[PDB]
Design a protein around this ligand. Structure first.
Ligand code: IN5
Ligand code: IN5
Ligand code: IN5
Ligand code: IN5
Ligand code: CA
Ligand code: CA
Ligand code: CA
Ligand code: CA
Lengths: 391, 391, 392, 392
């Protein structure tokens, strides 16, 4: 049962040492009592024995066990933030002459890592429509090494048909590493590894931390891919600090109570918006009619609270300020996943610049909301005062 | 004056806000009061204005200003540890078809990053002897992009002639990026940027933190190289957590009192060892006769406390255990830079495996010591009981 | 304001958050004055949220304090290193040689032991009352009574006071008494103590406000009448909490609503199952009809937390107690409560009798206290059922 | 053992460090018992370094405690949220209605205010003595004296007690008194209080032990005679410090030697320059010949820290005070001390007279207190010289 799992994940006695939570073990240097102990630790340095702080301390091991239990993985590799998890996960499997195939709705810095960093290293990238399903075979090349998914999509929220994509890819390039950015689902609302994906990546910064303070990336790997991701990321010096690891473990405890509120509130806002005279479209995976809703309903076991909607109007600069500057409860900021509700605008032309080898199909201003833990009726009231400012 | 600089570096009122130390600002999301504020922050997102936690908060900005003041740089890029600083600094400047030229005494994982990661990306690496000076021109290729220095060298402690190397490299491949791992000198005992080096990298984990807890890498850049390092590392998601940034700033405060004790103690141990019947050689940059001592004396303004010595004996496994297992005051561990004295052994054949395109010239067991803050006469007593165990 | 929106926003003024969502963490003893004039200004405002000296607080403390005054409707919020320090020092701040303290006999045992072991040797006497005494409290008032100390629900046995009756009765006789409550079970928020004419609402913020069993902190939210005295006398005893703890307590507030609702829903479901169970004598849950003071809870509170107790039909012997407690898979044995993890503790009737001064107990089986956490309620009920099979 | 080696290793047993160099940080209220038997064992040892409940401490606290007993030669180390809480609560733990407390009139002002404002209303009287009274202390002892409270060097004015004389005199008359000292200036280590027959050595660990002006914490290291009473009575008041603060205090110990030596060397160099300066009346530095109790410092201490004061030839008026203090570049205005940053504070003779009960002051110019930090001593002297040019 997810709730019981969340409360206990990673809390082995060897990590908590008489406490409820794991200990916080801050270290670089880790001490070997003897030559024989150093040899034991060296052989087990990637197997949960204390060796050197760059490999982890007890605090890290505890979070790694929790993430493996929650996402059904063989191992969990840690990073200083989600963008570092994305970039280094992809790097760990590529070589000069490879091709990367990425959804055109991937998080922008994931796109930019490929276009700006991988391109100089003899790796080419191309893109696909998130709703392509089994027709992704037209984009597969004999040198396709990575197939990178993000479901729902960044900003626009399109849900992939992961089963269809996975079957297609294994049929043509079975050696491909299939990755997903599974941040929206907090890794627990969509069990990526059970669907044939090799690596489930999170900006743990978001719903796993849950409070908008700490930054951390995770990559949960199947047994086929764990060693290579782990050792190559180690060679790039990737790790997260012990205290952040502790705080992430601690976020897990309330994840189920938080995600149920996020689902209930954001769906009710989405439903209210969908019926509002000033709204063109609502992009929420849980809302019937949204792009790939059917796949959300079949493949996920809940929703989080991030979604977007498109205004009937393309707001001009003065309207955009009147709208966004006068919110009482929604704050303007990047990221999401916390207790506080947030708001961000993107003009159609902003989104057009980040959908390579696609076409946008809306013309009004796109508003993305993260629905936090405030009373939902207060949030709806704030949104409705917003609409009066731009009617 | 270094001491006064250390106490005040980065402590602008905008960062301390009424306290002695900088504030600890934990954040991912950073809030914009208005559209106009978001536009201001966006334009200044790499210029010390609050934008998004991946770019930093006030705590990071404070440490970045301190590191720029201390090392004379245009900018300071932050990483989750030294190995991540090395790997990502080199990555930020390379492209398929480049050559990297690295001292054969570089830190092993720096070697391994090149041999195991860069090699798959169409980048070749070769090596040089640390004492090559101006004859490094024989190793320069028309596609040499990076010249990577580490002075003193890892484990064996050889000091380069940086002036001679730098002049040679600028004369042949002026477009090269010259980097140094300046960890031993804590960035302050050798002012790398004043000698023509482009980027001074530290495992800030070591002497800057000073207490063996926290892990962090720094790269202080000149104005020529700052933008590219900063933006490419950003694309790999490199950052450090706020609290670690705070603790690093805090280590700086005692760095001068610590480094003076480390120098005085370790030189006196080195002198005592050099005269000991059971010692073949002592490798300490401050000790006359050590490899590149003359360059240490001309180019550095002090010593830290890490050095090595070679035993007359190649200890067998039983002797190695009798030696290392029965120390009272020295602990066995990786890393160094803290208050606690540490000891590590390397057999000649271990070092031979990590000196590409060189030759070792010793035959006894090499012992590396980090000399901490304990009474030096107690440490010497512990070393002498050690010698009695293996006579 | 609606609780959940209030919780999210409490304390988060721009002067404390400085561009972030959460307050800054400002760690300091020394706080720097730019000038003689600035120092004079800070000195005047040293108890009024200007930076002065770390013992008085930093911006991190100020934020928590603001949050706590907002949520509990107070003029001020005094901070302490734990619950027990808040209790002991809030009582100390208002007494003097010759005073009498009247305390509920269901008070947390350390609160009792402070009165009987510390206050006694300072010329302050204490006596105790039954938690259901209500209006009849007048019977225990003395000419020198200074403090009337309430705890509702009761420690372990969970009895709810008729607060309206008690407060009216006290004010009718000793209007100038200081009325305090230990309002930890309600998290200060499910029972608005200061709206009921209580002077000081004290919590072990250790519990529900922190919510994760990993920081310790006490709070005392005061009305305007009593704030100064509590604050300044507490300061002379050196009482403060660390900035990092204050930041984590503020943080815990943000999930307090979603957590309390799950604790209510799950704990009531367990309590309802236990009441029907053949091996259970009685269930002590404020929200469960038939428990002591339930109708006062229904009337006076806006919700329940997850802590309650039940009485077994058996008085367990030592071997049965071990076989019961040692073999749980989901409940852990520990003190405290208020966190995400379910906890269990046992007391024998004779242990409880010993901490019920000037009153008698009302049960004879072993008493089991549960903290119902965030685990799936059916897994928890399954673990409790395996427990019962072990002592049939 | 030699101090620097001791400092590095103090508290770092394998049971606390668990493979790291520093102790673990174990954050907890609830501490889990695996069984009834384990709980019974923890309960017996709850004041003896077995995990029991976070109010009693975690492994992090145990480590600090061990370190502090080792460095100060004590049987036990009681922890508090700050210096002022250690003073107030250590005095409280040993008094009862009818007792008398004898305190040096150079005691930290809050220590004085605790006695005169809190203790007075609890039936405890206080009187004061001159710090140089030595053997003549017998003159101020009373049949009901319970505590003799020492502070050496003195707060602000820096007078050093003849501790050997005072202690012998007290023991000759009231052998069962509790003798306490506020040993913060010495960092517990430059004056081994418990070796001189003092019962309790108290510090504001806030200062030199933490060493960076960013955590607050008090300690009281006790002999075997007084440990239990201090510990248990302090516990009934809820006194504890947070685990993270305990970890940072242990951490500060590791650099205490290298820091104190620089504070000694730099502060003595400044003091020697000031004594020769035409605008200075007198220098109050324990290490500087001619200061009050210097010869007791030379005899009894093993070093100096960096805090001292000096008296200007001028009694500065308000405009000269601002022009002096407002325009420093390296010294900052703030309370506290013990950190890496140099600090400056001013007091007028009439402010000091007001906190010197039952004694008189010995100066008439403005009194300037300096904390000499880790900055280059010649830059510091240059900043002080520019200061003098501003009030010529
Ligand atoms: C799906 C997704 N995957 C990765 C990342 C990168 O994580 P880190 O910020 O922790 O490096 C993000 C970041 N997104 C916000 C900044 P926003 O969505 O506001 O741009 C994301 O949304
Ligand atoms: C010169 C030098 N430069 C980089 C690094 C990498 O820093 P991080 O450990 O913080 O990633 C090291 C690490 N060295 C120790 C593990 P050791 O020397 O014990 O192997 C080093 O020595
Ligand atoms: C109502 C109530 N009021 C105060 C305190 C004291 O708070 P601190 O533990 O933060 O000092 C407690 C403590 N209770 C547990 C230890 P337990 O209930 O397990 O004995 C309490 O329950
Ligand atoms: C000797 C001495 N003993 C105790 C304390 C109280 O410690 P805490 O501030 O940690 O509660 C002090 C405090 N002193 C500064 C505030 P200042 O000297 O600047 O007034 C002191 O000096
Ligand atoms: Ca808000
Ligand atoms: Ca040691
Ligand atoms: Ca459990
Ligand atoms: Ca300064």
């Amino acid at each position: 049962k997810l709730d019981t799992q969340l409360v206990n994940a990673g809390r082995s006695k060897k990590y908590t040492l008489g406490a409820v939570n794991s200990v916080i073990q801050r270290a670089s240097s880790l001490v070997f009592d003897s030559v024989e102990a150093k040899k034991h630790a060296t052989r087990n340095r990637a197997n949960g024995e204390l060796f050197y702080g760059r490999r982890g301390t007890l605090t890290h091991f505890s979070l790694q066990q929790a993430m493996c239990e929650l996402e059904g993985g063989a191992g969990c590799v840690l990073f200083p933030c989600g963008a570092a998890a994305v970039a280094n996960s992809i790097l760990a499997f590529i070589e000069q002459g490879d091709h990367v195939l990425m959804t055109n709705t991937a998080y922008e810095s994931s796109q930019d890592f490929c276009s700006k960093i991988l391109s100089k290293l003899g790796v080419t990238t191309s893109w696909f429509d998130p709703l392509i399903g089994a027709d992704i075979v037209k984009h597969l090349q004999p040198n396709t090494k990575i197939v990178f998914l993000e479901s729902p999509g960044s900003i626009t929220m399109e849900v992939h048909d992961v089963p269809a994509i996975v079957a297609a890819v294994r049929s043509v390039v079975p050696d491909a590493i299939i990755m997903i950015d599974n941040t929206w689902a907090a890794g627990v609302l969509f069990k990526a590894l059970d669907f044939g994906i090799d690596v489930s990546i999170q900006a743990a910064t978001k719903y796993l931390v849950g409070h908008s303070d700490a930054m951390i990336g995770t990559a949960v790997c199947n047994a086929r891919c764990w060693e290579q991701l782990r050792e190559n990321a180690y060679l790039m010096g990737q790790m997260v600090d012990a205290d952040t690891a502790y705080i992430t473990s601690r976020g897990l405890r309330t994840l189920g109570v938080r995600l149920r509120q996020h689902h209930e509130s954001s769906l009710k806002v989405a439903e209210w918006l969908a019926e509002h005279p000033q709204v063109a479209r609502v992009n929420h995976p849980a809302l019937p009619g949204s792009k790939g809703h059917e796949f959300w309903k079949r493949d996920f076991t809940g929703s989080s609270g991030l979604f977007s909607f498109v205004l009937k109007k393309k707001l001009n600069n003065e309207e955009l300020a009147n709208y966004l500057d006068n919110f009482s409860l929604f704050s303007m900021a990047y990221s999401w996943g916390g207790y506080e509700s947030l708001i961000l605008a993107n003009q159609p032309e902003h989104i057009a610049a980040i959908r390579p080898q696609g076409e946008i199909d809306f013309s009004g201003t796109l508003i993305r909301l993260h629905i936090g833990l405030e009373d939902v009726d207060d949030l709806i009231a704030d949104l409705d005062a917003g609409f009066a400012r731009i009617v």
